[PDB]
RNA sequence: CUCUAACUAUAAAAAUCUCUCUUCUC
RNA sequence: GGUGAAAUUCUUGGAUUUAUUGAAGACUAACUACUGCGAAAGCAUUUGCCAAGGACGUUUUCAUUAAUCAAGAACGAAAGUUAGGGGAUCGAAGAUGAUCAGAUACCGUCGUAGUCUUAACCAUAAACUAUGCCGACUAGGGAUCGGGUGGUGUUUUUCUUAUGACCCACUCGGCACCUUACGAGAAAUCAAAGUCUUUGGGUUCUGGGGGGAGUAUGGUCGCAAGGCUGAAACUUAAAGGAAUUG
């Protein structure tokens, strides 16, 4: 220790360090573009979703709330937004 | 890490990012956002669950970010802000729930203690709100006015 | 002064512990300052295993192992010699006493 | 202390001379149908022998009744119901481990779950049963301890209670014992609960018989033929 | 001499003098 | 079976006056009660291994007379509230029982261990010897 | 204790060196099979240094 | 660079005590 | 039975015992650890209902609502006091039985109130971590509890996913622990009791030598036990902390 770039830490250090503890607070979450096999509509779902979000066209609930990230419905296809 | 009425010292919170404008990938615009928010307002939902629904059901990061304005202020502009603010109303609901629990069974001395803490929180919050004059200066909660104010 | 950091209880953050009686002098001491032993021994002494073995049906009997937990007051623990008074810096060591049998 | 202040606020004979012998017979559920011998005073009217016999309960290790030493840590108790003459018939009355084994699988660094249950069997036998279960150190652990969560313990108890009730309410006591001897219920419980924990040493404890319908002597005759 | 028992004997003295108070009043 | 009539020993060995009381397989019928205190005088040694040993030899002799040759030995300490520990005599008693011709079988420990009952005698500071 | 002859004995038996230096990938099956980790370490060091790949089976059985 | 095993059981009573404390610099 | 030994005590109306039982009330052993929860007291069988709470996650909600707090409040072990209910055990008083010169004490056998409750008080503990609360920083290390992050990980198994379990790594908070001191302390010790003569982050409360004394007196709360508040006259050159050697 005794010398660091608190302005320029290694990106690995930032990734492992807790959020609100980095040089600038940066959320670890993101959004998801999710395709339900029911209808071809693509919906945006927050990673740590909270409500049992269903498709607007049909009752095909996509993400399930829990302590951590919303657990998906085993059938839908997701990409990171 | 104060945690008003508990020895707890955590920091479970949410850290909104550096950016203040909307994200580039956001295909929506302010107008549809405000119409949707106000539609939920007619649906009879408090601003908190409106925010969380817009965060999950849609790409709404934060209402201020994409609309330029804050949900309470938007509702006030459209005149659907509850006459009792969210947090005090929910504290009142919790207080009346605990009061019902205490009346239906007596010896819960520990539950009586936490009812006292709930009343203390209500008092402080109401004092702040009356300093900002959100609530009329005569407003006072003692036992049973809230028993109708919940309904 | 503080003879021990832990006060000898091993309570340190539990409010209060139920008391459990000493097995010899019936002293009431908290379950932590209730110096413990697991006396796993045979139901028949190792001295007389041969006589019991030769005069036994069910060849090579299991010969059960009697189990019981022993709770001493610390006064008994000093007198009944389960524990010994130790020198100052030797109070640090908390490990089992050097594996009696190995 | 041997001396007595002579307090008392010949007629000596050997009382065992007027005591005859009787033979214990186990039901057809067990394979060794002879148990041992019992001393009863000779059958004289106005307290006949069979008058005293009816109601006796005898404790015997299951290792003797099944031959194999695997049952060295089980113990059944049989009630005496009817006398055939110099040979008596018995029925299941209770079961329990020996205290040795019961203290054997209990150790530190593993929470034990007890699930009791009161049930009514197929015919009328009202019973109370116990189940003793232990969390298992997985064969990957570097964590020295193998505790369990309270919510998980509630789940385990719910599963065990459900399976116990399902078994007992369907069949009679005889088939209950017949499937109990190979402890197939142990394997069923661990199979149902395996997705929650490993949960080693599943066992069934203190099978306590509480109520019996009338006599059903025909069933006892079935168990002895 | 012993806080517990010096206190206890003082309590006994207080009780006796309170009985005397009751006698006088 | 090998014509062995199983008996039950049911040894009770407290800190005083060990007990050896052979009973039938039913347990309900009693045989040859003679205890430690019967075989010694001084009353200092009601529980002595020698008192227990004569008591066990006498019960074995009576078992020979009646005809019980195989015995199921049961060790029963004081248990319950009082010290839950085996006495100093019952071990010599069972050694004598095994020695005197009798064929042993199924030793077990039936000392009653309570689930937190009956705050026991001595006060709180306990026997202050 | 130690004297002149034992001194010389220690001296000679300490000067001892064996044949080919036991390293030089001569013993133990041409090229010391090692992990991917020191292999890519050498690669980042920028130097050829013959090698063979062997993943080290992260399991930590109690042994 | 490889290991997870046995062990014993003692507490009889013992109260009391008077002198007198006398120096450090090359 | 019982004890260092005995004796008081029960018993050929058969007690100690051996079995079945039934009874009431008590408590939840063994799991049970430098492990958990709660503000402290304290809380340990299971199931159902009741509300409550901490920590974690959050790109959700408002925008100083905050910290500590005279005055006032809610709890507060055990013992204790009223009344009503229980009445097993253990049991101050008492009765005894022993050692002893004395022993109305320790050891031993009975044993009233309490121990368990339901209402009403009492509000005192070595209520101890004898370390007030909220802030920020400073040093290495392992583990443990609760949550969450990733794992081409490992067994799991319903052919397989997915739980769950573990294993790895990281993070947040919690009881903590070990090492060292580069700092602190008079030290025993301390990772806070450090960042204090280089003296200042915000704060409430107590002490000014020891006896007198938490006593006298007056208020004040109480049915009472007593609790809170709280001196003086006089008296003494010490009492006291830690450590060292005998
Ligand atoms: Mg001391
Ligand atoms: Mg200790
Ligand atoms: Mg006494
Ligand atoms: Mg002593
Ligand atoms: Mg009798
Ligand atoms: Mg726990
Ligand atoms: Mg806490
Ligand atoms: Mg328990
Ligand atoms: Mg105050
Ligand atoms: Mg009463
Ligand atoms: Mg006397
Ligand atoms: Mg007395
Ligand atoms: Mg008594
Ligand atoms: Mg009380
Ligand atoms: Mg005080
Ligand atoms: Mg204090
Ligand atoms: Mg404090
Ligand atoms: Mg002073
Ligand atoms: Mg003072
Ligand atoms: Mg006064
Ligand atoms: Mg001193
Ligand atoms: Zn859809
Ligand atoms: Zn003791």
UniProtKB/TrEMBL annotation, chain A:
It holds the Pfam family Ribosomal_S27e. GO terms for biological process: maturation of SSU-rRNA from tricistronic rRNA transcript (SSU-rRNA, 5.8S rRNA, LSU-rRNA); ribosomal small subunit assembly; translation. GO terms for molecular function: structural constituent of ribosome; zinc ion binding. Zn(2+) 3 binds at residues 39, 55, 57-58. Zn(2+) 4 binds at residues 55, 58. Gene3D superfamilies: Zn-binding ribosomal proteins (2.20.25.100). Binds 1 zinc ion per subunit. Its cofactor is Zn(2+). Zn(2+) 1 binds at residues 36, 58. InterPro entries: Ribosomal_eS27, Ribosomal_eS27_Zn-bd_dom_sf, Ribosomal_zn-bd. Zn(2+) 2 binds at residues 36, 58, 60. Keywords: Metal-binding, Ribonucleoprotein, Ribosomal protein, Zinc, Zinc-finger. Zn(2+) 7 binds at residue 60. Zn(2+) 6 binds at residue 58. Zn(2+) 5 binds at residues 56-57. The keyword Zinc-finger applies. One of its GO terms (cellular component) is cytosolic small ribosomal subunit. Belongs to the eukaryotic ribosomal protein eS27 family. This is 40S ribosomal protein S27. It comes from Kluyveromyces lactis (strain ATCC 8585 / CBS 2359 / DSM 70799 / NBRC 1267 / NRRL Y-1140 / WM37). The lineage of its organism: Eukaryota, Fungi, Dikarya, Ascomycota, Saccharomycotina.
Automatic annotation (TrEMBL), chain B:
It holds the Pfam family Ribosomal_S15. Residues 1-60 form the Small ribosomal subunit protein uS15 N-terminal domain. Coiled coil: none annotated. One of its GO terms (cellular component) is nucleolus. Transmembrane segments: none annotated. Keywords: Ribonucleoprotein, Ribosomal protein. Gene3D superfamilies: 4.10.860.130, S15/NS1, RNA-binding. GO terms for molecular function: small ribosomal subunit rRNA binding; structural constituent of ribosome. GO terms for biological process: translation. PANTHER family: RIBOSOMAL PROTEIN S15P/S13E (PTHR11885), SMALL RIBOSOMAL SUBUNIT PROTEIN US15 (PTHR11885:SF6). HAMAP family: Ribosomal_uS15_A. Belongs to the universal ribosomal protein uS15 family. NCBIfam families: PRK08561.1. This is KLLA0F18040p. It comes from Kluyveromyces lactis (strain ATCC 8585 / CBS 2359 / DSM 70799 / NBRC 1267 / NRRL Y-1140 / WM37) (Yeast). The lineage of its organism: Eukaryota, Fungi, Dikarya, Ascomycota, Saccharomycotina.
UniProtKB/TrEMBL annotation, chain C:
Zn(2+) 2 binds at residues 22, 25, 73, 76. InterPro entries: Ribosomal_eS26, Ribosomal_eS26_CS, Ribosomal_eS26_sf. One of its GO terms (molecular function) is structural constituent of ribosome. Gene3D superfamilies: Ribosomal protein S26e. Keywords: Metal-binding, Ribonucleoprotein, Ribosomal protein, Zinc. PROSITE patterns: RIBOSOMAL_S26E. One of its GO terms (biological process) is translation. It comes from the Eukaryota. Belongs to the eukaryotic ribosomal protein eS26 family. PANTHER family: 40S RIBOSOMAL PROTEIN S26. This is 40S ribosomal protein S26. It comes from Kluyveromyces lactis (strain ATCC 8585 / CBS 2359 / DSM 70799 / NBRC 1267 / NRRL Y-1140 / WM37). The lineage of its organism: Eukaryota, Fungi, Dikarya, Ascomycota, Saccharomycotina.
From TrEMBL, chain G:
It comes from the Eukaryota. Belongs to the eukaryotic ribosomal protein eS17 family. This is KLLA0B01474p.
């Amino acid at each position: 220790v005794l010398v660091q770039d608190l302005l320029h830490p290694t990106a690995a250090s930032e990734a492992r360090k807790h959020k609100l503890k980095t040089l600038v607070q940066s959320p670890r979450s993101h959004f998801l573009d999710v395709k339900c096999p029911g209808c071809l509509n693509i919906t945006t779902v927050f990673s740590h979703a909270q409500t049992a979000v269903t498709c607007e066209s049909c009752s095909t609930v996509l993400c399930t709330p829990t302590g951590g990230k919303a657990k998906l419905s085993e059938g839908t296809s997701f990409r990171r937004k | 890490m104060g945690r008003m009425h508990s020895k707890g010292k955590g920091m479970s919170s949410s850290a909104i990012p550096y950016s203040r404008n909307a994200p580039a990938w956001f295909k929506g615009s302010s107008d549809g956002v405000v119409e949707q928010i106000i539609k939920y307002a007619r649906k009879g939902l408090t601003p908190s669950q409106i925010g969380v629904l817009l965060r999950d059901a849609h790409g709404v990061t934060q209402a201020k970010v994409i609309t330029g304005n804050k949900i309470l202020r938007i509702l006030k502009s459209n005149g659907l802000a509850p006459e009792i603010p969210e947090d005090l109303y929910f504290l009142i609901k919790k207080a009346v729930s605990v009061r019902k629990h205490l009346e239906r069974n007596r010896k819960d001395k520990d539950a009586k203690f936490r009812l006292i803490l709930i009343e203390s929180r209500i008092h402080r919050l109401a004092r702040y709100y009356r300093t900002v004059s959100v609530l009329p200066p005569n407003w006072k909660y003692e036992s049973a006015t809230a028993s109708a104010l919940v309904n | 002064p503080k003879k021990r950091a832990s006060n000898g209880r091993n309570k340190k953050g539990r409010g209060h512990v139920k008391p459990v009686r000493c097995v010899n002098c019936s002293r009431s001491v908290p379950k932590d300052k209730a110096i413990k032993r697991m006396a796993i021994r045979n139901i028949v002494e190792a001295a007389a295993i041969r006589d019991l073995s030769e005069a036994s049906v069910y060849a090579e009997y299991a010969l059960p192992k009697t189990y019981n937990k022993l709770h001493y007051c610390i006064s008994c623990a000093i007198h009944a010699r389960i524990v010994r008074v130790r020198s100052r810096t030797d109070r640090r060591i908390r490990a089992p006493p050097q594996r009696p049998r190995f | 202390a041997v001396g007595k202040n002579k307090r008392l606020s010949k007629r000596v004979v050997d009382p065992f001379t007027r005591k005859e012998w009787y033979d214990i017979k186990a039901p057809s559920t067990f394979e060794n149908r002879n148990v041992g011998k019992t001393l009863v005073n000779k059958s004289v009217g106005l307290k006949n022998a069979s008058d005293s016999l009816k109601g006796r309960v005898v404790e015997v290790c299951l290792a003797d009744l099944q031959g194999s030493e695997d049952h060295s840590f089980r113990k059944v108790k049989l009630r005496v119901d009817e006398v055939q003459g110099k040979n008596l018939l018995t029925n299941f009355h209770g079961m329990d481990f020996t205290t040795d084994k019961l203290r054997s699988m209990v150790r530190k660094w593993q929470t034990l779950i007890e699930a009791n249950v009161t049930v009514k069997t197929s015919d009328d036998y009202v019973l109370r049963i116990f189940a003793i279960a232990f969390t298992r150190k997985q064969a990957n652990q570097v964590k020295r301890t193998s505790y369990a969560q309270s919510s998980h313990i509630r789940q385990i108890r719910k599963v065990i209670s459900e399976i116990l009730t399902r078994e007992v309410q369907n069949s009679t006591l005889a088939q209950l014992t017949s499937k109990l001897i190979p402890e197939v219920i142990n394997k069923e419980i661990e199979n149902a609960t395996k997705d929650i924990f490993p949960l080693q040493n599943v066992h069934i404890r203190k099978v306590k018989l509480l109520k019996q319908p009338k006599f059903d002597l025909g069933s006892l005759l079935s168990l002895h033929g | 001499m012993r806080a517990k028992w010096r206190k206890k004997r003082t309590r006994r003295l207080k009780r006796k003098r309170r009985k005397v108070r009751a006698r006088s009043k | 079976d090998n014509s062995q009539v199983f008996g039950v020993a049911r040894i009770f060995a407290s800190f005083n006056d060990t007990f050896v009381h052979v009973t039938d397989l039913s347990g309900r019928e009693t045989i040859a009660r003679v205890t430690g205190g019967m075989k010694v005088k001084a009353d200092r040694d009601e529980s002595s291994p020698y008192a227990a040993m004569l008591a066990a030899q006498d019960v074995a002799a009576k078992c020979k007379e009646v005809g019980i040759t195989a015995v199921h030995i049961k060790i029963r300490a004081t248990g319950g509230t009082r010290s839950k520990t085996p006495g100093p005599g019952g071990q010599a008693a069972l050694r004598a029982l095994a020695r005197s011709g009798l064929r042993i079988g199924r030793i077990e420990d039936v000392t009653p261990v309570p689930s937190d009952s009956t705050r026991k005698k001595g006060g709180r500071r306990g026997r202050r010897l | 204790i130690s004297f002149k002859l034992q001194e010389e004995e220690r001296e000679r038996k300490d000067q001892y060196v064996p044949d080919v230096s036991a390293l030089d990938l001569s013993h133990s099956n041409d090229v010391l099979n090692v992990d991917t980790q020191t292999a890519e370490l050498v690669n980042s060091l920028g130097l050829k240094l013959p090698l063979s790949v062997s993943s080290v089976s992260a399991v930590r059985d109690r042994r």
